[PDB]
Scaffold this active site. Structure first.
Site, short mmCIF file in Angstrom:
data_model
loop_
_atom_site.label_atom_id
_atom_site.label_comp_id
_atom_site.label_asym_id
_atom_site.label_seq_id
_atom_site.Cartn_x
_atom_site.Cartn_y
_atom_site.Cartn_z
N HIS A 272 -44.64 38.34 15.85
CA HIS A 272 -44.02 37.04 16.04
C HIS A 272 -42.53 37.20 16.37
O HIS A 272 -42.00 36.55 17.29
CB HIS A 272 -44.19 36.21 14.77
CG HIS A 272 -43.51 34.87 14.82
ND1 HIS A 272 -44.13 33.74 15.32
CD2 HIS A 272 -42.27 34.48 14.45
CE1 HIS A 272 -43.30 32.72 15.25
NE2 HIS A 272 -42.16 33.14 14.73
N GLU A 273 -41.84 38.06 15.62
CA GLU A 273 -40.42 38.29 15.83
C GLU A 273 -40.11 38.90 17.19
O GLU A 273 -39.21 38.44 17.89
CB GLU A 273 -39.84 39.17 14.72
CG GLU A 273 -39.79 38.47 13.38
CD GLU A 273 -39.22 37.06 13.50
OE1 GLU A 273 -38.09 36.92 14.01
OE2 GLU A 273 -39.90 36.10 13.09
N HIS B 196 -39.82 36.66 19.96
CA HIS B 196 -38.51 36.04 20.14
C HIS B 196 -37.60 37.01 20.88
O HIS B 196 -36.90 36.62 21.81
CB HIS B 196 -37.89 35.67 18.79
CG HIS B 196 -38.54 34.50 18.12
ND1 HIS B 196 -38.80 33.31 18.78
CD2 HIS B 196 -38.94 34.31 16.84
CE1 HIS B 196 -39.33 32.45 17.94
NE2 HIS B 196 -39.43 33.02 16.76
N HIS C 267 -41.12 28.85 19.95
CA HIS C 267 -42.26 28.50 19.12
C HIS C 267 -43.31 27.71 19.88
O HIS C 267 -43.00 26.81 20.69
CB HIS C 267 -41.79 27.75 17.87
CG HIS C 267 -41.20 28.66 16.83
ND1 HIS C 267 -40.45 28.19 15.78
CD2 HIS C 267 -41.27 30.00 16.68
CE1 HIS C 267 -40.07 29.21 15.02
NE2 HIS C 267 -40.56 30.32 15.55
#
Ligand SMILES: COc1ccc(S(=O)(=O)N(Cc2cccnc2)[C@@H](C(=O)NO)C(C)C)cc1
Ligand SMILES: [Ca+2]
Ligand SMILES: [Ca+2]
Ligand SMILES: [Ca+2]
Ligand SMILES: [Zn+2]
Ligand SMILES: [Zn+2]
Length: 166
Positions: free
Chosen positions: A120-121, A124, A130
């Protein structure tokens, strides 16, 4: 609905390097390397991006485990709440991923799963925001799922390739 970070920042290169600044004492050093390596691979598999780990020098993406205020004006909140945060593509702090050391990092589900959080990180780090799609890894909610069978959702792939294609 996948979202891209405001401004649409992207890495303009394919050969990207990352470096693990320090290791959380919760996990074994090699399990940490495994987790992150596999997390990057999740994104390499669907794009022309290639990630390479380095131990010395300045990496494009720095991975760090920090507690509370740690020098970026984005303080962690102790166990619970914020798990980790990362920054969009760019030089300097850009692309860096920070994990709250007050969480208990595990290889599975005993606490907060490093791998999953990391996927998930890194999303980014690469320019993804998101997603509104609840089954996308970029969905704002942490939820442990089987790691051995994990797979990026169609939304994630569709979103990441809208930035780098393949
Ligand atoms: C699956 O991987 C994950 C990694 C971190 C988180 S996180 O709960 O810490 N989180 C998302 C969030 C949820 C609810 C309300 N506000 C923010 C941070 C976030 O998006 N980090 O990347 C936010 C506070 C900056 C969730 C999932
Ligand atoms: Ca926290
Ligand atoms: Ca960086
Ligand atoms: Ca910890
Ligand atoms: Zn930070
Ligand atoms: Zn996030």
């Amino acid at each position: 609905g996948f979202r891209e970070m405001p401004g649409g920042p992207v890495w303009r290169k394919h050969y990207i390097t990352y470096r693990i600044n320090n290791y959380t004492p919760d996990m074994n050093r090699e399990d940490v390397d495994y987790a992150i390596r596999k997390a990057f691979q999740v994104w390499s598999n669907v794009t022309p991006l290639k990630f390479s780990k380095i131990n010395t020098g300045m990496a494009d993406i720095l991975v760090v485990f920090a507690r509370g205020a740690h020098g970026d004006f984005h303080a962690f909140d102790g166990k619970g709440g914020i798990l980790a945060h990362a920054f969009g593509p760019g030089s300097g702090i850009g692309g860096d991923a920070h994990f709250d050391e007050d969480e208990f990092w595990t290889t599975h589900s005993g606490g907060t799963n490093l791998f999953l959080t990391a996927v998930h990180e890194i999303g980014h780090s690469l320019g993804l925001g998101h997603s509104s799609d609840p089954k996308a890894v970029m969905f704002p909610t942490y939820k442990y799922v089987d790691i051995n069978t994990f797979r990026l959702s169609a939304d994630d792939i569709r979103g990441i390739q809208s930035l780098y294609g393949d």
